[PDB]
């Protein structure tokens, strides 16, 4: 499917604070009222979604059916592959030099045969229930920005937070979805293991360079931005 | 030109000239503002002349403060000295004023000045200098009646 | 302050400084003359008068109303209702960049401005030619008519019917001040323009200028002095000029505001101190009487226009 | 300063503005977070047992700063040299890689461990790059390497077909062929075996005691920087204009205590001009603004040389509570001169209303008088009819024409 | 101009100049200014009536 994301897909650009002023900025940000694409009707094909400028993460997921994300060269062996499982009480963030299936699942805990991970990186576990994310790389550090607000995207205003940053540097141009359901498939060839749970649906949509102008109120809360190069009153 | 070699005492030289470009530039731009605003009181310094020498004009402050009659021009190395002659009253003295005079049924009012009045008197002056004169037909219009 | 805008708490900065020349002692001598220029513009409109007139206290003219131009004595500031609204609509120490206040404060200029007013009732016209003196402002009215041709019958006869249009006048002059919101543009824009001209140098100082960084407290410890002079050079070029003009457009402005201020007296002492013959230099009409306001940055002259109407077709030889 | 500022001699009646007034920072402070997650080189420095030559281990401490206090281990080091960085400098510097590598050799065999050197060990076993840029500590380990019967458990390779590379690692035990003939993989004649054994001993000499050698191999690579964080200082010094470093943001002012709630991830701050306005605290978590340090101008108000020499001296723009009758004005404030409470004609102008002049004695400051006083008396039937002329004369000059100049 | 007169079709060229300062947005701001100016001057004159 294909929609919009009207006034969603912004985030902080730098850690400064400011005190109701405008702040204008040349960054990765994503353009408003662009085309996104809704995979809402994808129950486990087609993994192959790009990493150019970035990803940004949308989801109404019920409770828990989500298990983490991987990051990936080109996902053959010996290619540094980060993969960002997350478990109920803790996170686990490692770069592995692994050949990945298709659709690697979780419900298992050992993806491929022939796994070799070499990073160290713990952190606090992430994981009406919007669970907005941004992913870039830039300057060698793997950048995420989280976000878990209440209510598909409405028109309101909520800000992107920085929560947590990690140093690699790679080719990353891979993306894709990991679910959770109760039928167990250790088949990693099929790809059609459907079963009766929440609705699912992975937001993609590809971040740009453009030129946001945003406001910060008295309490350095970003609470509206006009673009650049949208609209001529922009 | 003498401590360093000319190949490499180029940047030197150039820095130099800017500088010393950049030192003539602003001193220009000062000049053309001190030009302007000399050019703006020369002109007000030909209209005052025009205006005060070359006869009488009837403005306030003009030609001098009060009431100007004349004006000498003086020269001076780089400008010009105005002496205006002003004519000021003075010496001042309280009277009794009304608008008009009711005789006859009719309301007479003066020609040029204002009724004076000095105690059980009336007589007729202008607005600058005290000249008691009686109260005629010469000095005075009807303009109706005293309602 | 042409060594703290340049060089930020830097020894060596300061030492560097003063090889470029006597520019740091230039564009302090032009700024100071700038602000005594100022200081003289406020003197040569407002100060005409030597001494200080006031109001009497029986509130009785003649008919005429002018609680709206005379100060409030309510009001612990001195000012009149016309005064206190223009001044609720003029919207008003960071870096080596600081605003020197003016000598006359708005108190002063509001005695001034209660002074004249005072004089131009009271007296006429003879305020400002010499010796005040007392002649009744009806008397004033009819010669002010007299003196652009209207015989003194007209508002001798019909002086309720002139008193109370220029109530109503004075009374609409507020309410036509109030509706338009950009009628003070013009005392708005100079501020404006002053903001910003103060606002865009502390902008331009976080610009590189070809340096690798903008403050000197890194150029001074990443690199050596010996190997970070050329630096510090092209640093204080760009700071210098960046000031340099700066120092021009505030000249710029400071010559434009003279004229103004020039403009503003001329008109003052020809509209406020007597009656002009001009045609639309003491306001469109016929000329009779002006009345000056102070504002924080400015002179509102409320010029009385006597102007003909419902004229008749007749037949001339 | 006057006669300095002015270039003359003979200074006039007036006011001018000779230098400005800052006032000195007296401390100066850094703030950087707590120091946190600490490497263990003691898990290196004081290991159980150390591992032999041909299997030296090779140990990366990652993100986890760099505090160099091997004094503690055995401070009594037998050598202790730095190559490409120097001992102490050392602890303030940022690397990518901070390897560390650790084997027990002789003490005459130290020396082959070091950049270009010759041996058995430095060619066979353990093998330094040239351009080596780190340090190699070595201790002694009799006590503990050591045994009445002999420690045999340390081996060493004592032949080889080449020269190891740098920074090599061979575990092959194959059968050195010394011979003509390959020997098929048997240990006899001209067929020996490559690792020999050490057989330590508490009674050995100095020179044959176990020597511990452990080397720091520094590397700086394109990567980030998660290292080297030994950094520590002084406590906050609130009302008083110091220079701070607050976790790289550095800069002269006051601190002062706030009331804006910042964002819990939000640490720095600027207004709308692009100046640093607050700051928050590493060590415990709490926003300072930063208010400029007290600066503006001083002014001296001097009646000339001509009567006297008694001067004013006018701090403008700033309140002199901080750092001869002190009068705050709104202008600023002036030392040297009384407020005089009666009104005269206005000689040298202040601001905001306020002149000075010499009352003659010394520098008085009062408000300025915009004139006389006269109330005339308006009434509907008085007037006042001049009766005298007076023929006065008024001079006004101005200028016309300038200097003609050319370059 | 302040951008094709200074830099001619350079992306470069562009990205150093916006490190000058807001020289681009002031020196374009002045003579926008100058131009309304001269765009009121014809108004007080010949459009009096
Ligand atoms: C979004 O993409 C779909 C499929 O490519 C297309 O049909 C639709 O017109 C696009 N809408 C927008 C916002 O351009
Ligand atoms: C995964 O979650 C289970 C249930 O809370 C927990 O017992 C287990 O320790 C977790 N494992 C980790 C540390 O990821
Ligand atoms: C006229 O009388 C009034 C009231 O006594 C007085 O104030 C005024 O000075 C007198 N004027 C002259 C010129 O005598
Ligand atoms: C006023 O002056 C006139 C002319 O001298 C004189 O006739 C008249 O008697 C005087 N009146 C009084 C009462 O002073
Ligand atoms: C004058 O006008 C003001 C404002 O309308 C009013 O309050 C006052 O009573 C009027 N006074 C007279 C003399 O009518
Ligand atoms: C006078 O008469 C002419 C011709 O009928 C007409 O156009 C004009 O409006 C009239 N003016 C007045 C003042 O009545
Ligand atoms: C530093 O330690 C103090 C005292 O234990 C603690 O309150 C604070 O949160 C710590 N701060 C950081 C940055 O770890
Ligand atoms: C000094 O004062 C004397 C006496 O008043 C005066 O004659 C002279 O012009 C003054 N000179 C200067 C330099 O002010
Ligand atoms: C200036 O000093 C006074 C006297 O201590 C004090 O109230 C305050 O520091 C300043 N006053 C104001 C309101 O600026
Ligand atoms: C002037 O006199 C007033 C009233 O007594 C007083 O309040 C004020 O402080 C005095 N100013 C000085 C100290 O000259």
Same mark, same amino acid.
């Given at each position: ?143 995420? @920005?989280?976000?878990? !607000? ?10 992107? #937070? ?18 959770? *359901? ?53 | ?35 302007? $605003? ?41 400008? +010009? ?67 | ?10 020894? #060596? ?176 824009? +100079? ?37 970070? $002079? ?6 204080? !070029?760009?700071?210098?000029?960046? *000031? ?25 002492? #020809? ?30 002259? *409320? ?15 | ?21 800052? +006032? ?186 176990? @020597?511990?050698? +452990? ?56 207004? %709308? ?64 001169? #009384? ?14 209303? %306020? ?53």
């Amino acid at each position: 499917s294909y929609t919009n994301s009207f006034t969603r897909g912004v985030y902080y650009p730098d850690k400064v604070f400011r005190s109701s002023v405008l702040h204008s900025t040349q960054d990765l940000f994503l353009p408003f009222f662009s085309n996104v694409t809704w995979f809402h009707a994808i129950h486990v094909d087609n993994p192959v979604l790009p990493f150019n400028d970035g990803v940004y993460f949308a989801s109404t997921e019920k409770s828990n059916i989500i298990r983490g994300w991987i990051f990936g060269t080109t996902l053959d062996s010996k290619t540094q592959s980060l993969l960002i499982v997350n478990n109920a009480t803790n996170v686990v963030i490692k770069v592995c030099e692994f050949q990945f299936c298709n659709d690697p699942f979780l419900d298992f805990r050992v993806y491929s045969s022939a796994n070799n991970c070499t990073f160290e990186y713990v952190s606090q576990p992430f994981l009406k229930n919007l669970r907005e994310f941004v992913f870039k790389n830039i300057d060698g550090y793997f950048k995420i @920005y989280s976000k878990h !607000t209440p209510i598909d995207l409405p028109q309101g205003f909520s800000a992107l #937070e920085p929560l947590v940053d990690l140093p690699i540097g790679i080719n990353i141009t891979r993306f894709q979805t990991l679910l959770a *359901l109760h039928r167990s498939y250790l088949t990693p060839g099929d790809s059609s293991s459907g079963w009766t749970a929440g609705a699912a649906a992975y937001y993609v949509g590809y971040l740009q360079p453009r030129t946001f102008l945003l406001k910060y109120n008295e309490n350095g809360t970003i609470t509206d931005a006009v673009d650049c190069a949208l609209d001529p009153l922009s | 030109l003498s401590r360093l070699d000319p190949p490499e005492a180029e940047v030197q030289i150039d820095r130099l000239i800017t500088g010393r470009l950049q030192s003539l530039q602003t001193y220009v731009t000062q000049q053309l503002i001190r030009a302007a $605003e000399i050019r703006a009181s020369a002109n007000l310094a030909a209209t005052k002349m025009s205006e005060c020498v070359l006869g009488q004009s009837k403005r306030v402050d003009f030609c001098g403060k009060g009431y100007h009659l004349m004006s000498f021009p003086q020269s001076a190395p780089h400008g +010009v000295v105005f002496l205006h002659v002003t004519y000021v009253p003075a010496q001042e003295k309280n009277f009794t004023t009304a608008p008009a005079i009711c005789h006859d049924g009719k309301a007479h009012f003066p020609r040029e000045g204002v009724f004076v009045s000095n105690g059980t008197h009336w007589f007729v002056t202008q607005r600058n200098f005290y000249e008691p004169q009686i109260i005629t037909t010469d000095n005075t219009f009807v303009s109706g009646n005293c309602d | 302050d042409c060594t703290m805008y340049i060089c930020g708490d830097s020894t #060596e900065c300061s030492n560097l400084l003063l090889q470029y020349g006597s520019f740091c002692t230039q564009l302090k001598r032009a700024l100071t003359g700038i602000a005594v220029e100022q200081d003289k513009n406020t003197q040569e409109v407002f100060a005409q008068v030597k001494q200080i007139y006031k109001t009497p206290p029986i509130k009785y003219f003649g008919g005429f109303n002018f609680s709206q131009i005379l100060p409030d004595p309510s009001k612990p500031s001195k000012r009149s209702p016309i005064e206190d609204l223009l001044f609720n609509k003029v919207t008003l120490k960071f870096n080596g960049l600081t605003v020197l206040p003016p000598l006359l404060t708005d108190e002063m200029i509001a005695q001034y401005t209660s002074a004249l007013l005072a004089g131009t009732i009271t007296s006429g016209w003879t305020f400002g030619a010499g010796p005040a003196l007392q002649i009744p402002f009806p008397m004033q009215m009819a010669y002010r008519f007299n003196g652009i041709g209207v015989t003194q019958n007209v508002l001798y006869e019909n002086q309720k019917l002139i008193a109370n249009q220029f109530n109503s006048a004075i009374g609409k002059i507020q309410d036509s001040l109030s509706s338009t919101p950009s009628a003070l543009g013009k005392l708005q824009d +100079v501020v404006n323009h002053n903001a910003q001209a103060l606002n865009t140098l502390v902008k331009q100082l976080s610009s590189k200028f070809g340096a690798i960084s903008s403050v000197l407290n890194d150029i001074l410890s990443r690199l050596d002095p010996p190997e970070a $002079e050329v630096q510090i050079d092209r640093l204080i !070029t760009g700071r210098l000029q960046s *000031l340099q003009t700066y120092v021009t457009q505030q000249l710029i402005r400071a010559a434009e505001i003279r004229a103004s201020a020039n403009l503003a007296a001329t008109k003052m002492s #020809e509209c406020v101190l007597g009656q002009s013959k001009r045609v639309d230099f003491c306001g469109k009409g016929y000329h009779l009487m002006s009345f000056p306001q102070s504002a924080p940055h400015g002179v509102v002259f *409320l010029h009385v226009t006597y102007v003909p109407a419902q004229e008749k077709n007749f037949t001339t030889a | 300063e006057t006669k300095c500022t002015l270039k003359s001699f003979t200074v006039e009646k007036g006011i001018y503005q000779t230098s400005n007034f800052r +006032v000195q920072p007296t401390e100066s402070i850094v703030r950087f977070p707590n120091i946190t997650n600490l490497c263990p080189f003691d898990e290196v420095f004081n290991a159980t047992r150390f591992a032999s030559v041909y299997a030296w281990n090779r140990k990366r401490i990652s993100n986890c700063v760099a505090d160099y206090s091997v004094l503690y281990n055995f401070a009594p080091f037998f050598a202790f040299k730095c190559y490409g960085v120097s001992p102490t400098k050392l602890n303030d510097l940022c690397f990518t890689n901070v390897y560390a590598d650790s084997f027990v050799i002789r003490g005459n065999e130290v020396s082959q461990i070091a950049p270009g050197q010759t041996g058995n060990i430095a060619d066979y076993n353990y093998k330094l790059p040239d351009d080596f840029t780190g340090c190699v500590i070595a201790w002694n380990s009799n006590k503990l390497d050591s045994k009445v019967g002999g420690n045999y458990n340390y081996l060493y390779r004592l032949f080889r077909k080449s020269n190891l590379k740098p920074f090599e690692r061979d575990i092959s035990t194959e059968i050195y062929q010394a011979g003509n003939k390959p020997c098929n993989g048997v240990a006899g004649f001209n067929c020996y075996f490559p690792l020999r054994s050490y057989g330590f001993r508490p009674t050995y000499g100095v020179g044959h005691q176990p @020597y511990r050698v +452990v080397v720091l191999s520094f590397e700086l690579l394109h990567a980030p920087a998660t290292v080297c964080g030994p950094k520590k200082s002084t406590n906050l010094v609130k009302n008083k204009c110091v220079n701070f470093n607050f976790n790289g943001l550095t800069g002269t002012g006051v601190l002062t205590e706030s009331n804006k709630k910042f964002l819990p991830f939000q640490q720095f701050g600027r207004d %709308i001009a692009d100046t640093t306005d607050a700051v928050r605290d590493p060590q415990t978590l709490e926003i300072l603004d930063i208010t400029p340090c007290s600066f503006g101008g001083v002014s001296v108000i001097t009646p000339g040389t001509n009567t006297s020499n008694q001067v004013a001296v006018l701090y403008q723009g700033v309140n002199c509570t901080e750092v001869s009758n002190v009068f705050q004005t709104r202008a600023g404030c002036l030392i040297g001169a #009384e407020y005089v409470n009666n009104s005269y004609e206005c000689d040298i102008p202040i601001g905001a209303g %306020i002149c000075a002049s010499y009352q003659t004695q010394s520098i008085i400051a009062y408000t300025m008088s915009l004139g006389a006083e006269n109330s005339v008396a308006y009434s509907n039937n008085s007037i006042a009819i001049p009766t005298n002329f007076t023929i006065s004369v008024t001079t006004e000059i101005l200028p016309v024409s300038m200097t003609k100049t050319s370059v």
